[PDB]
């Protein structure tokens, strides 16, 4: 494992992040207020705006106390900075201002009893992610703010699926396309809680992979000491789960080159961003491009070839009365007033269908157009289908 000397000092960056969270203002600090809201169970998602970081860096440079470029470091490698920001938030979480029912939560009771057991043992501990009740996301650097401060915004620059290469892995990038598939929301396990039948103690496990091996044997101090062989049993009540959704984003027609087939890129949605993407909507998904290593025999058989996906971080969603309406239905065509009026009547389709005797007169004013080639039948079809909210265009 030979070492390298890279020009990054994570301690200074952590100090920068803590100072930004504590002092940044844009009343009191914005992020301090956000953390106060999170403490009172009022907010379950914290979003870090890179524009705020850039403004803070500019202010620090102006004051003369030049600091490290945090925006570039976040953009180049965002996976580490998620954990760094989570740690910084944890170290400065304000005390709750609104009383809450602590005893209701199972985790609170379990940890309190673990503390009691530890105190008893001493008289003779848990992963930080377990107790976290919030999600962290990165908002890309807006183009306007970057141009104001004379900087290039790689994160917010839209890219096609083709333009996302292997050299972009591990960075915060934006993708433009049309969602073609969204899966059902399912629970993804992050921390697993076990129990000992003999010991009476609780064990925990962290999952950061596609697959995991469950525990079988107790590892507690008591068990070890006493030599008691106790079996570990999974407990889903005390485990931590996060909503998971997998989506497919495909290239737009105008983005494909000449004589090429469109390509698709996988998207992973975690936390509160779930249900923000639906099929058929053109979106600007911002996320962290990361690989998905295999495990076990598959890993060995696959080789160096790696799958990839996008960790969703931000989603931007793209956008005389009778005669007048008839004429405005399809201005491009030559005036056909009667046909346009019939199309209006079909579109509105007003009817009172409440017979209640077993059947009810059909409530649809069906329209059929038949004519020799040359009339703009296709144009009427396309226009009237576009205007209609539920209009569906099909070919026999």
């Amino acid at each position: 494992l030979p070492s390298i000397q890279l020009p990054v000092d994570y301690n200074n960056l952590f100090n920068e992040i803590t100072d930004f969270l504590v002092t940044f203002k844009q009343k009191g600090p914005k992020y301090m207020a956000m953390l106060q809201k999170v403490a009172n169970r009022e907010l379950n998602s914290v979003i870090i705006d890179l524009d705020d970081i850039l403004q803070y860096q500019n202010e620090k440079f102006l004051q003369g106390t030049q600091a490290d470029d945090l925006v570039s470091a976040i953009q180049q490698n965002a996976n580490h900075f998620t954990e760094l920001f989570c740690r910084a938030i944890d170290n400065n979480m304000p005390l709750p201002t609104k009383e809450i029912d602590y005893k209701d939560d199972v985790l609170d009771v379990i940890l309190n009893q673990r503390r009691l057991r530890n105190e008893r043992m001493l008289s003779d501990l848990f992963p930080p992610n377990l107790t976290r009740r919030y999600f962290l996301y990165f908002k890309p650097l807006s183009q306007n703010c970057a141009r104001r401060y004379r900087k290039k915004a790689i994160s917010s620059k839209p890219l096609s699926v083709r333009q996302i290469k292997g050299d972009f892995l591990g960075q915060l990038i934006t993708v433009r396309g049309i969602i073609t598939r969204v899966s059902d929301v399912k629970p993804a396990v992050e921390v697993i809680a076990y129990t000992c039948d003999q010991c009476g103690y609780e064990v925990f496990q962290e999952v950061n992979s596609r697959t995991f091996t469950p525990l079988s044997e107790c590892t507690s101090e008591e068990c070890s000491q006493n030599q008691t062989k106790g079996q570990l049993f999974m407990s889903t009540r005390a485990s931590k789960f996060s909503a998971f959704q997998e989506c497919k984003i495909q290239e737009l027609s105008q983005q494909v080159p000449v004589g090429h087939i469109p390509r698709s890129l996988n998207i992973h949605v975690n936390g509160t961003l779930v249900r923000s993407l639906s099929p058929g909507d053109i979106v600007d998904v911002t996320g962290i491009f990361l690989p998905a290593p295999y495990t076990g025999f598959k890993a060995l058989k696959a080789g160096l070839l790696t799958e990839t996906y996008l960790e969703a971080q931000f989603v931007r969603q793209h956008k005389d009365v009778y005669n007048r309406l008839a004429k405005s239905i399809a201005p491009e065509i030559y005036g056909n007033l009667d046909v346009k009026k019939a199309l209006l009547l079909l579109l509105v389709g007003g009817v009172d269908k409440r017979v209640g005797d077993g059947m009810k007169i059909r409530g649809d004013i069906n329209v059929c157009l038949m004519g020799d080639p040359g009339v703009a039948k296709s144009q009427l079809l396309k226009a009237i289908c576009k205007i209609s909210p539920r209009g569906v265009y099909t070919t026999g």
Binding site: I4, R162, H260, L305
Partner: protein, 618 residues
Amino acid sequence: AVFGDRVRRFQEFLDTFTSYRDSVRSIQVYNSNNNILPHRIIISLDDLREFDRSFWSGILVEPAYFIPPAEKALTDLADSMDDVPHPNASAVSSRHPWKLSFKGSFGAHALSPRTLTAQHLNKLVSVEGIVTKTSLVRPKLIRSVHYAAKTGRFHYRDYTDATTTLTTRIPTPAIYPTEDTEGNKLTTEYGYSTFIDHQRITVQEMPEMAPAGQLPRSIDVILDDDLVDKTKPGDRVNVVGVFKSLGAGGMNQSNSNTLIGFKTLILGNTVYPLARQMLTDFDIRNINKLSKKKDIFDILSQSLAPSIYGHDHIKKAILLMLMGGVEKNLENGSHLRGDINILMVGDPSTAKSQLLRFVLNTASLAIATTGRGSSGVGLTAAVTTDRETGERRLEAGAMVLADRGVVCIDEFDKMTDVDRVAIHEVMEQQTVTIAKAGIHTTLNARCSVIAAANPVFGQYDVNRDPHQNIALPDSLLSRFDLLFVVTDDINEIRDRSISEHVLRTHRYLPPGYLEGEPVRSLAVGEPKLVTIPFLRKYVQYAKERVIPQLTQEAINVIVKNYTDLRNDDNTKKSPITARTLETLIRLATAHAKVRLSKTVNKVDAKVAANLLRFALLG
């Protein structure tokens, strides 16, 4: 020991020729200024042979031992040249060495997929063929960078593969290190790790060059880094690489076959297109001067298919189709195509197939299909699986492949309705819709369709109406801008002229051939009829740098012609319709493109009207 000597010798070679140093400096300057140019340098094998015979011979016959030294020397030269003040952390951790590229003359190593044999293994070769397959692009892991929080130092690992390096090395599983040497936990730094793109293509021997009675053969090629997306299926390429062998090839006890050979493929160094002709200042001036002639249209039309007697109007239509109109898409959503479709229905032996072959050869992009030889799926797109990745995908069809090109359909009437439907959709919408195996996509298919067909009876009958003569659907017929009905009429003067022309053509002999002798590259990188290459250059120039706009006089002429043609007692071989107005506008725009004119004038409208009138009423 020898590696260092070879590195030093290649450093001396690079120093002697300053062109490569200047190219590297220019690439570095461009990259620093700013989208980016890959770290690749094209060197001439002739210069290397002139400088040092031993190094050139070694590179040609033993690339595995002579290429890596040259690459290292070039990388060292570039690094010494680099003067970037602050190197970014990713730049420091990046594994981006310069890659060498070759050109010149491969004396006996210039081969094809058919002539590649075991004797050429582990040698630098040049392969020429047609791309038939193209795997999906996926990243490949070469270096991994890790961080240890307690120690505060970054640890890295390097990976290798059978295809990533020329020299064999111990295989490295992709398992990310998890723990340090002393037991310290490690965190993967994806942003600082290095991944490179990987792709596999299949190059096929050109069918025309295949032996008699044997189907073409193909060879697999591996492309990495910047050569990932330099080709698409149907392209003619000249690939340079090192022929290699992979795997045990049954040597292992697990394979009981004992009759199976090794795997073989090529690690591509260059991809040389074989489509767009570079235009020189002299060529541009000649094109302008020729275009300034009043009768440029006549000369250009006559220059097409000199061996075909007559058919002047069909030749003019083919020229206008090649030039093509202007494609306009409106804000509301309506799309107006600029492609011109042509259909020919006539008696046997009327030069329809020969015209199709000529337009196939002349057009920059063209795909040939037959009626009985094609299918609906084969026209549109097929669902298949990717070998490399094992992922369900789409394979481009005839229509798709010919995007922004021309598709020639022979025996148009010998098809099936099932097959016909695909074409109908293609022409009507210029897009392909696929709903198979959980695939939902729209494929762009913007191609001009030129087809030939025969009457139902096999011979056009004047007595019977046009509808009875042609069995194709009216809806499909209406999409063709021009319909030409050509008949074989027996006349003494015309018969004598045609016979004399055919006899004169059949007496042609090629240069450098003796009488009675039957008809059987040097480098890799490299009223008078107009020669075909000049015609191709003219077509490219006109179709690239001209977008004619309509004017009022042309509009007056067009509307006058439409009003006269649509409401006239004289019968027409094809019915008049509002599509005829669009056809007239398209033909006027194409004729304007012929003259390299920014505006459509009265002459263009008159020519379009005359062509349409001839096509309709003969």
